[PDB]
């Protein structure tokens, strides 16, 4: 249904060890599709998904120029942030930026984003109106006045409403065999005795895409959300994801427990039970 395009950027200064490290990656939904690393041999933006390789060399030239320019801007901005926060030149600091757009099933803009962070904390963010700013502190208010004077929000709005949406739709069409394919979870339940009295039931979901999933345990149709241990959804390494949910159960009572799986790749939700 709904889709997103995001570009992520990290610059990390390293005083005494050369210029800051700069790494940026682009995502459509949960799929990484481009990458640039300043520390790589002859840095260029590189493809990481098959559907983006069909773009011509002028695409990769422009992308690489933009990345190199961002790395340069970050070097200057990191020096400025030292002044804004009365910091010494000896420490390592981190500058992060994300921007992108969400589009709905009808292919129109749902929301645009552009936000920056310094040393892991919010610095300045474009508001949902794509016309105003939220500054985190008095330093970021200095940036906010500069950006209001230079009409930065109007420049971002043009991109987020226009190019961001148009190029996302292009990618979704060229990558439709993967980006518009939901892979359903392969599911099973395993049984792990703790003692003579109790056992862990673990409900597994493997090999699904996209990462969004809901796993819950029920006993006689009552949600055991209080007693369920969930792991964070984790990448399998092959584009797909994994997750499990576990409950501790009185031995001999396993058949009272059902695991419920919801994912966009499934016709209808699944219910599983432990099978001896």
């Amino acid at each position: 249904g709904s889709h997103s395009m995001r570009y992520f950027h990290t610059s990390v200064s390293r005083p005494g060890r050369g210029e800051p490290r700069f790494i940026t990656v682009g995502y459509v939904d949960d799929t990484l599709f481009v990458r640039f690393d300043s520390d790589a041999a002859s840095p260029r933006e590189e493809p990481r998904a098959p559907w983006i390789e069909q773009e011509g060399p002028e695409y990769w030239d422009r992308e690489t120029q933009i990345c190199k320019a961002k790395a340069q801007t970050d070097r200057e901005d990191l020096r400025t942030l030292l002044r804004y926060y009365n910091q010494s030149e000896a420490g390592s600091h981190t500058l992060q930026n994300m921007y992108g757009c969400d589009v709905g099933p009808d292919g129109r803009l749902l929301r645009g984003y552009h936000q920056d962070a310094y040393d892991g904390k919010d610095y300045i963010a474009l508001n949902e109106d794509l016309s105003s700013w939220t500054a985190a502190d008095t330093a970021a208010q200095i940036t906010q006045r500069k950006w209001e004077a230079a009409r930065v929000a109007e420049q971002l709005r043009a991109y987020l409403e226009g190019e961001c949406v148009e190029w996302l739709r292009r990618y979704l069409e060229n990558g439709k065999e993967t980006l518009q394919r939901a892979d359903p979870p392969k599911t099973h339940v395993t049984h792990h005795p703790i003692s003579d009295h109790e056992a862990t039931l673990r409900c597994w979901a493997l090999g699904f895409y996209p990462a969004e999933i809901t796993l819950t345990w029920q006993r006689d149709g009552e949600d055991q959300t209080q007693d369920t241990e969930l792991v964070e959804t984790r990448p399998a390494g092959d584009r797909t994801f994994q997750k499990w949910a576990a409950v501790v159960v009185p031995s001999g009572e396993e058949q009272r427990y059902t695991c419920h799986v919801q994912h966009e790749g499934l016709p209808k939700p699944l219910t599983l039970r432990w099978e001896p």
Binding site: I66, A69, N97, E163
Partner: peptide
Amino acid sequence: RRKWRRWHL
């Protein structure tokens, strides 16, 4: 595709 960043902090 990416947006040119043309502003400083």
